[PDB]
Symmetry: C4
Subunit: 206 residues, 4 copies
Amino acid sequence: MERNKLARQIIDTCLEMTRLGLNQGTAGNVSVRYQDGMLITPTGIPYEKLTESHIVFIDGNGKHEEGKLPSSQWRFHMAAYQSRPDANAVVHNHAVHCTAVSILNRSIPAIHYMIAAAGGNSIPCAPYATFGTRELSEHVALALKNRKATLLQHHGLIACEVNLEKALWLAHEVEVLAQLYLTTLAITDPVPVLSDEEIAVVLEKF
Amino acid sequence: MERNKLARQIIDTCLEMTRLGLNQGTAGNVSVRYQDGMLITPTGIPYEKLTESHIVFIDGNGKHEEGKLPSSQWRFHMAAYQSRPDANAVVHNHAVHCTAVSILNRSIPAIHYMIAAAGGNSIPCAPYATFGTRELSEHVALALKNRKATLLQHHGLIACEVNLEKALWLAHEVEVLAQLYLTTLAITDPVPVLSDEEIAVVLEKF
Amino acid sequence: MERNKLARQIIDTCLEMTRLGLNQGTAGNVSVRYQDGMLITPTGIPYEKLTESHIVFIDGNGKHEEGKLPSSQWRFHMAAYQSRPDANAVVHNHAVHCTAVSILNRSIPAIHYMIAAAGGNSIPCAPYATFGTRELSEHVALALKNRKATLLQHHGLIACEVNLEKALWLAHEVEVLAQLYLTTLAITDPVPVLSDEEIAVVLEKF
Amino acid sequence: MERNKLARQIIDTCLEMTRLGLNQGTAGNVSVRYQDGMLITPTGIPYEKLTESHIVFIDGNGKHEEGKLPSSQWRFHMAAYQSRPDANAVVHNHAVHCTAVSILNRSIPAIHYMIAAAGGNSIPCAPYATFGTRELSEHVALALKNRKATLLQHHGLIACEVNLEKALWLAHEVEVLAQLYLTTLAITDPVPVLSDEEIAVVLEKF
Ligand SMILES: [Zn+2]
Ligand SMILES: [Zn+2]
Ligand SMILES: [Zn+2]
Ligand SMILES: [Zn+2]
């Protein structure tokens, strides 16, 4: 749990994200909680050229390491960390099904019991704000108060968890739920969902 | 047909399942009939870290090997084995098209002649029950009385056959039929199907 | 252009077909014109275990080599060869989009100028008949009189050309046209098409 | 920035295009600005057999190197270069989602903020004309006056940028926007879009 070990795992997560077909447009950024701030992917540099020394450290004040440019979305990574003290890793991407649901400005309801992996009976959709602004950060902070993942309207997805492996797994599961939702919504609306009682049982079971 | 040979084939089936794009969310579990019970994948451990000694033996009583945790869905694997004496292998996954049809709570009708590979003119959909419960097991046992594969409402798919190779092949074919069904259902409802007479001819031919 | 060279190319075409995502369910079969009949893939044997000596020779009478089982669909390969003297290779598969259009029992109209690669302004759909019957063969023979590719209702696709490389390429293009057609049909029906005049110009240009 | 270095990058872009799933039907062609004209992919030769010496030089007059056949679509590559002096590379393909939107004859509106990567609030659709004609070239030239990418009705996509890496990236992003658009259009029409004000802010921000 030295910086370089953590930097490699961020890079592995970027590669795995592309392998899984979640990083379309090379839009993602990945971060981990570190010291008083976080380690995050840099802006510009394509994922396949990424090396350990490219990873940027941003402190609690928002001051980033000299000579390195953090992702343009670093601020809502910091907002997730402040809003969810238990989160140690954050994954952001523009997975197509998630982003399509975020264009409809819909929450994903409990169409499958795995919806409870994000903490409740839904995956919310935070209202649009211009990328990189404080206003976007506030909407994300509010949406993550009681959920580990959120859609961002007209934009994409943020998922947070205790480590990169779970954060990536969660992100992937939300993309499956989004695809399931869009496929059934094209047939019938509304889509059959599981009741709050049933989801309370599953949550207790998890 | 020693335990280790069977354990390797289970692991190969998990890998092949992911290769085929049926194991989305890393939700599957695979088992084979063995001695008085079965060998099944363990809970927790990601598929790529899976080794022969991770595979768990569960006897006829439901007692599992000391120090190993069987999949959380072991019970409906045991229900399939008791309901279908001819089954020697069972594959479960959350393939997206199958799961989407299971959310509509629909059976897949005879939209293609390959529907007869599961034993009749349809692929049923068993009613939802909380994962891991006896009630889920009963619905699965009933649905598999005269079919080798079934959807599970709000959940996924179970397919069983005489060996892992056929069980995987069947699972894959049901996922193709599910995709075919959802694609045509978005255009027209109902979907044209083949008649019972035609399917009786194909069954006789198989 | 010895038998073994031709047998390798058939096997390569099976692999390439799977690479392209056209061979879903391991449903395809591939043949080439040879001597007085054809060389075709065998029934049963999965594609990845396929070796040169597995390829079966079937003569003009329909008598196949001793000790080898030709694909269960050999008859409509022979029907294509008799109907289209210019065809030297035939590819059959159950590509999902093609098969979904074949379930609607629709012809694919001229939604794109590449429709002319199959010889006219459409890709027809031959009426269903039980697999392996003479009746299926007659429908295929009629549909291929003035087209190099046809859908088969409730079944899949047949594409024929001057060599395996073009036959595979054609099969792939029809699968793209099928996907294009289904995607736009879910939005609007009918789908805008190019006129007969325009297609006559493109045909002249090819 | 010798010819051979540029020829390798064209070939790498063809391979990458196929990797990304944008080159379906082996329909693409790629060019770069060079000397008084351009280097472009040849007609006929499949991408995987492509070697540096296959790449064709076409001058400003349209005269191509002796003994080599340029892509059949070279003319609208030349039209892009004359219309957009800043473009140094041009990518053309028949990506399925783009082509499906081009069959509807629709422009893609601002359903996502990444729409501004092509220069405005939309991705236009140029009216159909027979491939390889001067009339097709004029429509492309007009559509690219204030956009870096355009759909071509009943045909596919053209994307242009300052280098091959950005041109490919742009092409890929337009394919994601096309898929997003088609997925949401099947659910609701019209699709929610971002306002002109919002897009002006994002453009200023880029
Ligand atoms: Zn983003
Ligand atoms: Zn399950
Ligand atoms: Zn077939
Ligand atoms: Zn083209």
